[PDB]
Design a protein around this ligand. Structure first.
Ligand SMILES: [Mg+2]
Ligand SMILES: [Mg+2]
Ligand SMILES: [Zn+2]
Ligand SMILES: [Zn+2]
Lengths: 116, 52, 162, 58, 107, 242, 114, 185
RNA sequence: AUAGGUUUGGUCCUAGCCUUUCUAUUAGCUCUUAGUAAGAUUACACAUGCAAGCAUCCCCGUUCCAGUGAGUUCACCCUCUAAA
């Protein structure tokens, strides 16, 4: 399918059942369907935890970096995962979320002190 | 062979029209000072472009 | 049973039992010999038994069959550059010419092992592909999460029911 | 999802694209953070491009 | 540049009543999925014999041009590798006939 | 000084465990198939026999005493903005088919300001999850229980015990070496060595007993055999080791 | 065939594949089966006639070859004429089973017990 | 009686069979040719034994457990490591699955006897020279405690930029505080 | 296809039809709880509801997503050659 400049964009893709969120990073186009055609498949994503947690994530840098240098872009969740893994620097949105969580915790502590 | 000639003719006509009789900025890029709207579309504008 | 003389000549297994693999150079494979002349037993046995194997090892290369065309049979080949590889098998055994072509034009074990390693690399066993190309499509079938909500209901933390 | 020529449910034309308020110090810190992060990302992309070029040359 | 697929080809000549051209086919051997036996398969092809040197029913090689200069043509006769009747033996460069030597070897 | 790969030591070890083309090449309750028969001369029979002997020789080779591993204590990066906020610890690794499992980079984003490379147990678990190798169950097998271990020891078939111990854990794990030493000690109780004659034994039993100076059972077995020159060679090897 | 199953159970054979080709005539089928069972080349007699031992490479066991029969006196020191591509008229069913090309609505389906 | 491990070697069980298989005594009545690919779903019918009783659902003293070694070894080809098919077993599919699970549990426990081959090491090498296992020198910022890129943390910019942004965001501002409090009970 | 019924006063040979197994549905009745995939069959016409605007005014999704199996060798491999 000839897309309007469909450039490679590593995006996510569902793969679970109802009440069972499951995802899988895939190197697909910017306009192709979520679970549609794709070039290469990367390490699947494990959102839900289990016994002592098993949030497993993998990446094949040997080909991921090649496809990135070949003119492919990255999505926001891709940058989030890269920051969580450590490949790319920590995403600033994550730092803003952490600061907001710290401020909310401070407000909760203030409320708890006011309870008395 | 049966080539698609009508499609090519329509494409050429539309391209020639949109390239020659293109509406000038005075018609589409105009701004209404009473509601901040652009003719040829009928949509509003961002809020940070009011006092400007 | 089969309505032929030598059914073993065409059994797939016998064809896959080969070994010679022409390199990416030879383009045409022409052979000709005299059948009435019993002196060319090697060439006859070759054209009879090994031609199916050669054709199955690579259908891209061209193969032409001819009969009475010269007193002394020969195996004329054509390379991608333009030269020719003339190897004689008259008064010889098919195994001799087979080993000769395997050592000269046949793909060495290094190239075959490299191709096998490349194919194995392509056969990514870690990604969760759709079975046909890989293994374990979803994590629900392997250890890591609840073993399929269908095989067993989900715990109390199921989404929606909250 | 709307193919231009559609009945277009007239339910979103009654809203104003209002930008929520913003702080000064936090906004400047975030702007500097974004600038430096984009610089680092562009540097990493240039490094990857150089590596790909070296591989193609080899 | 190099749009043609089949590069080197050596087929049999048939059609020759044309200007600077000649029809050629290759008696290939395709495998059957059910019979598991090879049969005499052939497909006609167009060549560019600019000199019409070859006749009907012979063996000649054709050089595939980088790009087809016409609709169906995509090859060019290079040289007669084996002239039927006047064929030359690879070993012992001398003419030969039906399983016989027109001129005795040893020269 | 120890010289585990010494020529004389390896020769004496191979002598202790004969080839045995019948016990090593014993059939197992698995898929059956119709055998094939042929008629050859005696030279071809001798060639087949020596080929089977070479195959049996290639059979035994492992394992060496690699001792207990060391927990990796290397941190990649860290963060001060978090420091205990998002627990659960997210795991991340890298895929490389052209790199062995002993050169991976399994990162684990922990909540605290750190970023270790995971332990060895979690490393092997993630490797099995990503690259399912033959055997090596994800969860620990129930056979390794005290009662189950005793029952297996009572079966008088320690070959399958060692096979399972080697197929489950890795040759460098701590529990692996522990179970191996436990099995060796159990075999030590009531002298007997004819059971471990068609499997791994030279590297785990004889070498371990020579290192621990527990050569009483081996000496008794050698005396029961017949050789005396082999006994003197073993005494010389023990003197060299100590 | 169920009749063949009973015949084998009475003889002693436990399990053995057999393609009941051709017509299904009880009397003629049983007579042909008896004739075939009476005309069989054993291992000991074949070895005594030819001389060479019985070489085999069982897949269940290891490469260790185990002779099944040996001659009763002489031993042909020369090997058999290992002439490749022999003239063994195999059946098309054998090829269809080896290549898995056989397909139908009753190929190899689950059968009853006992 | 109660988890049968002594009754297996009793006299009644030996007289009823002794050396014959228990799965062969059950015959399947069906249409012409071969019975269906599936047998009865459940031995009983949520109460009493309905239809042809299974080879095991006929006596209250015939339970199953991981300790039933002889029973599980006799009810399945202990000499062939290949499970049969539902028509061959000819038993209540519920009990078929139960027996399969019991055999799996016995194999995972060690009671059952069967060949257990081994495998090869996870890596041809047994060294630790790579940095991922030998050592990993830290960075100056790692030793200093502060993470890389100090601008990630709080850094109160000059008041000039704040006034400029306020001029940009005139009547749209919020209440900002100092650095992010690191307290969270 | 390991199998059965079937031409006759009977047997042998050839061979027709059907039964025996698995998938798609529902005419009939009947269906304790809970969980999981999917719920067009009409390329006939549609009431309506909803599905795509952020945004310093500009590109941009509208040329995708979601469906159809009417028509239907336009898919896989190589080369050339702009949009990223
Ligand atoms: Mg009748
Ligand atoms: Mg249609
Ligand atoms: Zn699921
Ligand atoms: Zn029951």
């Amino acid at each position: 399918k000839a897309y309007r400049g469909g450039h490679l964009t590593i995006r996510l893709a569902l793969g679970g059942c109802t009440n069972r969120p499951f995802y899988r990073i895939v190197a697909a186009h910017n306009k192709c369907p979520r679970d549609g055609r794709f070039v290469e498949q990367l390490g699947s994503y494990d959102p839900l935890p289990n016994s002592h947690g098993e949030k497993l994530v993998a990446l094949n840098l040997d080909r991921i970096r090649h496809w990135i240098g070949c003119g492919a872009h990255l999505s926001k969740p891709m940058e989030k995962l890269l920051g969580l893994a450590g490949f790319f620097p920590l995403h600033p949105m994550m730092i803003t979320n952490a600061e907001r969580l710290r401020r909310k915790r401070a407000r909760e502590v203030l409320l708890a002190s006011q309870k008395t | 062979v049966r080539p698609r000639l009508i499609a090519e003719l329509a494409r050429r006509v539309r391209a020639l029209r949109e390239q020659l009789n293109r509406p000038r900025d005075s018609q589409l890029y105009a701004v209404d000072y009473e509601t901040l709207t652009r003719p040829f579309s009928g949509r509003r504008l961002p809020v940070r472009a009011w006092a400007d | 049973p089969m309505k032929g003389r030598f059914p073993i000549r065409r059994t797939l297994q016998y064809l896959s039992q080969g070994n010679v693999v022409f390199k990416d150079s030879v383009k045409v494979m022409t052979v000709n010999y005299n059948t009435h002349g019993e002196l060319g037993e090697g060439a006859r046995k070759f054209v009879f038994f090994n031609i199916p194997q050669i054709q199955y090892k690579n259908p891209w290369v061209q193969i032409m069959m001819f009969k009475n065309m010269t007193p002394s049979p020969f195996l004329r080949f054509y390379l991608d550059s333009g030269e020719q590889v003339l190897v004689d098998v008259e008064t010889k055994s098919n195994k001799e010419i087979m080993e000769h072509i395997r050592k000269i034009l046949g793909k060495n074990e290094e190239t075959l092992r490299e191709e096998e390693e490349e194919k194995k690399q392509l056969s990514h066993p870690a990604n969760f592909g759709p079975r046909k190309y890989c293994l374990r499509e979803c994590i629900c079938e392997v250890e890591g999460q609840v073993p399929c909500p269908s095989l067993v209901p989900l715990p109390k933390e199921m989404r929606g029911k909250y | 999802r709307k193919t231009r020529h559609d009945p277009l449910a007239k339910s979103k034309i009654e809203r104003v694209n209002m930008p929520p308020a913003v702080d000064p110090a936090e906004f400047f810190v975030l702007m500097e953070r974004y600038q430096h992060y984009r610089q680092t990302v562009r540097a990493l992309r240039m490094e990857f491009v150089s590596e790909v070029q070296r591989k193609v040359h080899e | 540049r190099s749009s043609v697929h089949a590069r080197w080809i050596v087929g049999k000549v048939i059609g020759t009543k044309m200007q600077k051209t000649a029809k050629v086919r290759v008696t290939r051997l395709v495998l059957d999925p059910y019979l598991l036996k090879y049969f005499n398969k052939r497909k006609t092809y167009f060549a560019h014999d600019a000199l019409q040197q070859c006749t009907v029913g012979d063996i000649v090689l054709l050089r595939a041009l980088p790009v087809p200069r016409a609709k169906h043509v995509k090859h060019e006769l290079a040289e007669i590798v084996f002239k039927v009747g006047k064929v030359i033996d690879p070993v012992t460069g001398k003419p030969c006939a039906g399983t016989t030597y027109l001129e005795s070897p040893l020269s | 000084k120890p010289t585990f790969m010494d020529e004389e030591v390896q020769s004496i070890l191979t002598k202790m465990t004969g080839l045995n083309l019948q016990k090593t090449f014993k059939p197992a309750i698995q898929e059956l198939k119709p055998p094939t028969y042929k008629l050859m001369t005696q030279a071809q029979l001798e060639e087949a026999t020596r080929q089977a002997v070479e195959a049996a020789k290639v059979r035994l080779k492992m394992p060496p005493v690699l001792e207990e591993r060391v927990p990796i204590n290397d941190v990649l990066a860290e963060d001060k903005i978090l420091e205990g906020t998002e627990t659960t610890k997210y795991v991340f690794t890298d895929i490389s088919y052209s790199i062995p499992h002993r050169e991976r980079f399994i990162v684990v984003r922990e909540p605290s300001g750190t970023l270790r490379k995971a332990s060895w147990e979690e490393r092997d678990r993630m490797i099995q999850v990503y690259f399912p190798k033959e055997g090596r169950k994800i969860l620990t097998p129930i056979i390794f229980k005290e009662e189950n271990l005793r029952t297996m020891y009572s079966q008088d078939r320690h070959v399958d015990v060692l096979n399972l111990c080697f197929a489950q854990f890795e040759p460098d794990s701590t529990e692996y070496i522990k179970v191996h030493h436990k099995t060796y000690e159990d075999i030590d109780k009531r002298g007997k060595y004819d059971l471990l004659r068609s499997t791994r034994y030279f590297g785990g039993m004889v070498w371990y007993f020579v290192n621990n100076k527990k050569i009483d059972g081996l000496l008794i077995d050698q005396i029961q055999r017949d050789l005396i020159d082999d006994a003197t060679n073993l005494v010389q090897l023990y003197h060299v080791l100590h | 065939h169920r009749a063949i199953i009973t015949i084998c159970r009475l003889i002693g054979i436990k399990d053995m594949y057999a393609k009941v080709s051709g017509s299904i005539n009880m009397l003629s089928l049983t007579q042909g089966l008896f004739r075939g069972l009476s005309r069989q080349e054993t291992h000991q007699q074949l070895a005594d006639k030819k001389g060479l031992h019985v070489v085999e490479i069982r897949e269940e066991c290891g490469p260790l070859p185990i002779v099944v029969a040996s001659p009763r006196g002489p031993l042909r020191k020369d090997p058999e004429p290992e002439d490749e591509v022999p003239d063994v008229k195999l059946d098309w069913e054998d090829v269809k089973t080896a290549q898995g090309m056989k397909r139908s609505v009753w190929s190899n389906l689950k059968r009853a017990a006992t | 009686k109660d988890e049968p491990w002594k009754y297996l070697e009793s006299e009644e069980y030996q007289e009823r069979y002794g050396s014959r298989p228990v799965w062969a005594d059950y015959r399947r009545n069906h249409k012409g040719g071969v019975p269906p690919q599936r047998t009865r779903k459940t031995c009983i019918r949520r109460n009493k034994v309905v239809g042809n009783p299974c080879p095991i659902c006929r006596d209250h003293k015939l339970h199953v457990d991981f300790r039933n070694v002889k029973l599980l070894e006799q009810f399945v080809c202990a000499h062939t490591g290949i499970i049969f098919y539902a028509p061959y077993t000819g038993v209540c599919v519920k009990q078929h699955k139960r027996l399969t699970q019991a055999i799996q549990k016995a194999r995972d426990h060690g009671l059952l006897i069967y060949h257990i081959p081994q495998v090869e090491p996870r890596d041809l090498d047994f060294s630790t020279s790579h940095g991922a296992v030998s050592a990993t020198p830290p960075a100056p910022t790692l030793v200093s405690g502060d993470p890389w890129y100090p601008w990630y943390n709080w850094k109160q910019p000059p008041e000039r930029e704040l006034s400029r942004l306020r001029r940009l965001y005139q009547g749209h501002l919020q209440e900002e505080s100092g650095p992010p409090p690191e307290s969270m009970p």
